[PDB]
Ligand SMILES: CO[C@@H](C(=O)N1CCC[C@H](C(N)=O)C1)c1cccnc1
């Protein structure tokens with residue numbers, strides 16, 4: 001679990017969105033595994049606006065933050081899970097690291113701010129849904 005809190009927005013994995021998220025919906029995209037809902041209180045996270053390929057992510061199944069090198073956002077084939085069939089997920093970045101079911105939502109960040117959140121795992125790989133192109137999160 002986990003979210004990004006920027007401005008009056010909450011960014012979560014679409015597959016983990018709650019009823020309150022759907023009832024206060026701003027934007028959602030199944031192909032990216034992202035959903036954004038509106039919040040009453042202002043958040044403290046800032047979004048990175050950069051081309052970094054190195055950063056640090058939070059892994060809840062280890063209680064640890066790990067430094068990683070990650071690929072540029074791309075269209076990647078992801079295996080069937082309880083939440084989606086096997087399909088192509090867009091705007092996804094991969095790295096080598098631990099990610100098991102429950103780690104979705106952990107933040108990946110670089111020197112400029114939040115880059116994205118954990119969205120996929122297994123086999124010693126972790127995938128992150130990028131948010132750096134969503135410029136509207138800053139206004
Ligand atoms: C977070 O890791 C899970 C994962 O990749 N999922 C399930 C949750 C939905 C993910 C997606 N974005 O399509 C895929 C996972 C699965 C299967 C095995 N190990 C780990």
Ligand SMILES: [Zn+2]
Nearest residue numbers: 050052110112
């Ligand atoms: Zn950066």
